[PDB]
Amino acid sequence: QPAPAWTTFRVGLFCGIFIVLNITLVLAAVFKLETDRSIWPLIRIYRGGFLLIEFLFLLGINTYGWRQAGVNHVLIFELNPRSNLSHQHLFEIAGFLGILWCLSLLACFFAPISVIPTYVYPLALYGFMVFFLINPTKTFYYKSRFWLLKLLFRVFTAPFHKVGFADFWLADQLNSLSVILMDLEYMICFYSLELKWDESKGLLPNNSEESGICHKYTYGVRAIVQCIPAWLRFIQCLRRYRDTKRAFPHLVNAGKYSTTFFMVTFAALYSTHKERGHSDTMVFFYLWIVFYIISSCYTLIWDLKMDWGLFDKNAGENTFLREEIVYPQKAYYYCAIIEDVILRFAWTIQISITSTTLLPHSGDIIATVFAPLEVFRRFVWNFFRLENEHLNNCGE
Amino acid sequence: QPAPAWTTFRVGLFCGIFIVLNITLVLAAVFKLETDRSIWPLIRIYRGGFLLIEFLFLLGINTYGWRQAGVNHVLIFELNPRSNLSHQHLFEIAGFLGILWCLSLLACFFAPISVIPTYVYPLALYGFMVFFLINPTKTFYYKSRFWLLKLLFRVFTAPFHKVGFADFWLADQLNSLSVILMDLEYMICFYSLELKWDESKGLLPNNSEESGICHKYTYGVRAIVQCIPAWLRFIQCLRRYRDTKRAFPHLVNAGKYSTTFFMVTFAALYSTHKERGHSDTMVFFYLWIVFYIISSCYTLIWDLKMDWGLFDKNAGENTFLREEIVYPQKAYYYCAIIEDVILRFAWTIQISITSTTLLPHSGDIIATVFAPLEVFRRFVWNFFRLENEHLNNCGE
């Protein structure tokens, strides 16, 4: 059914304010923001909000495509039929949050008037976001936030509860968005140990030895945060095997989800080896690279054959595809297959350097540049995973 | 007729961009625009565009009101029943012109760099508006622009063509937009006579005797371009009387529009005598105030009694209104009566102030404040005029 003009009008209003705010923010950054002050902490803090906004927009795009293409995704997610969110609500929420993020960033830039210089705005934005998430009144999409909160509870306690479709789906979407988790941990570390709260001005050049502790792994504060979603999904799959006792897919997935654990622990060992400067440290490079290959070359084989279900023996006229395809043009299929193999390697590299403390001056730049790319990889992955599930359900 | 969601999205986008541009323009004006330079030429240049944008938005509100309340404008305007322009398109055009106007004003405020320092943006904006109006392509509401141009041609040569509803309605609307003509004339004079076109800057001191040449009226075309709309409507009503052979309504109406001729000529005569310091100059004042009252107290009885059909003897239970009404709240009618009575005086005050060059310091300011009020008065007027026309058509 066509949505009322109020919803669409709100979507457009928020989109336009968002666009103009982005342009004026770029102009202010290029012109007003002096380069001498380091601005890396600001980006490291606001990257999480940007990623969340982008993910919400992209999810709106996927649900649009799902309704257009004929995928019966309400039954697949086992949603409530009479109360569902279409693309416009997701667009409106994303635009609203983007307006707030842009306003907070602009305030941090200019600092119009206050006595505490700039370190209230990020806390305020994140506090309002979490308040929106857990607001107990019956307004602003109460059902959807209730369902999401219950499902988050189920996912983070998954080794105990039964696992369903939306459980592991949001488990993966958390696996791609781990950047927000490490950003939150770094923000807590910075606000706890580094910043002079009982002072003025704020950020200043760091010359002391104690500076840069949050850049270090200390004991495990960096690697464990990285592998947390891997642990969640690993334990979910183990439990699914335990209830089901079906060998092939459930036991195979454990290895795929444990390869990242092996890669992360090897990266941490290499970090401590550069700290020690051992003679064999260079040799430890090779193993990492090996387990880099063994990582990517694993999940790739899983992506095309098991996730998306390509390379069917009954391909027929559909070259390098399955017998039955719902999307009209094979061009998107081939484009996605091409770009996924490119983006997976960058994702693994990003995970490695965001916890290994490598490339000291360019590592965070690397993290920034390929942070909003695995999200697009997952945005592509969603379409084909859900359509494969729809045809699998249709077959049986 | 549910419009497509894209139209509503564009309306929202343009509204949001317009709001943010207005806010940043206000901020830049209070902060960045230094006050040493005389700025009144900028206001006298951009006032025409502002008034046109405002009039277009208010017409959108008017047509939405007619459609919702039951005022059947399609039959009376003689528009094609199957091709009509809804209020959302009027909102779109108003927002588009407003965004362009805001961008041009901001550029004139800043003017990053060029070969021509700052005075290309006004001609650029007005030329864009004209090329939009007279574009011969079959795009951008290819019926509305052509219909408006044809009606403008019919109105501007009124004493020759037959007179229908749309002709006199647009003539009445034009009666409230003489400020556009005054602004256009002043801009032409400034860019033709005084401005050093082959030069730079544009902030020459105003204390020189050479300044304010276009503010003078000794040549006497200011008054004529002022009363041009009055002449158009007067000769139109005279032609209507000639064609109809009915003295009462058309002839009294013609006298009504005739009074402003005496208004303007007496105002100009006082101005000339006062500059010459003629002994009995205040004598020329006296008749003026008389021709003040006999003007306003004239048009009022046309607006309240004949235009709207109020104060009817056969009203019945609805005291001080007509017998039948369509709008629910009498507070609307009473507030409209009070506001019409209040603003009918300010309209003639503004006319005399603009065409007489009195109050050398406060005249421009008071004209600026009273300009966006008689257009709102006309906006209020259309409601009840079209409702009375619909009642007349239904009854007979």
From Swiss-Prot, chains A, B:
Consequence recorded when altering R344 to A/C/L: Decreases phosphate efflux
Intramembrane segments: 140-157
UniProt-reported outcome of changing R240A: Increases phosphate efflux
Activity regulation information from UniProt: Allosterically activated by inositol hexakisphosphate (Ins6P).
Expression sites by tissue: Widely expressed. Detected in spleen, lymph node, thymus, leukocytes, bone marrow, heart, kidney, pancreas and skeletal muscle.
Impact after mutating D307A: Decreases phosphate efflux
Effect noted on mutating K256A: Decreases phosphate efflux
Residues on Extracellular side: 34-38, 112-117, 197-203, 278-280, 360-361
Effect recorded for W347 to A/F/G/L/N/Y: Decreases phosphate efflux
Parts of the chain that traverse the membrane: 3-33, 39-70, 84-111, 118-139, 163-196, 204-245, 247-277, 281-308, 328-359, 362-396
Cellular compartments annotated: Cell membrane
Mutation effect (D172A): Decreases phosphate efflux
Reaction catalysed by this enzyme: phosphate(in) = phosphate(out)
Function: Inorganic ion transporter that mediates phosphate ion export across plasma membrane. Plays a major role in phosphate homeostasis, preventing intracellular phosphate accumulation and possible calcium phosphate precipitation, ultimately preserving calcium signaling. Binds inositol hexakisphosphate (Ins6P) and similar inositol polyphosphates, such as 5-diphospho-inositol pentakisphosphate (5-InsP7), which are important intracellular signaling molecules involved in regulation of phosphate flux.
Domain comment as written in the entry: The SPX domain plays a role in the regulation of phosphate flux. Inositol hexakisphosphate (Ins6P) is bound between two SPX domains of the homodimer. The SPX domain has high affinity for inositol polyphosphates and its affinity for inorganic phosphate is two to three orders of magnitude lower.
Similarity-based family: Belongs to the SYG1 (TC 2.A.94) family.
Disease: Basal ganglia calcification, idiopathic, 6: A form of basal ganglia calcification, an autosomal dominant condition characterized by symmetric calcification in the basal ganglia and other brain regions. Affected individuals can either be asymptomatic or show a wide spectrum of neuropsychiatric symptoms, including parkinsonism, dystonia, tremor, ataxia, dementia, psychosis, seizures, and chronic headache. Serum levels of calcium, phosphate, alkaline phosphatase and parathyroid hormone are normal.
Name of the protein described by the UniProt record: Solute carrier family 53 member 1
Species assigned in the record: Homo sapiens (Human)
Gene expressing this chain: XPR1
Location of this fragment in the whole protein: 227 to 622 of 696
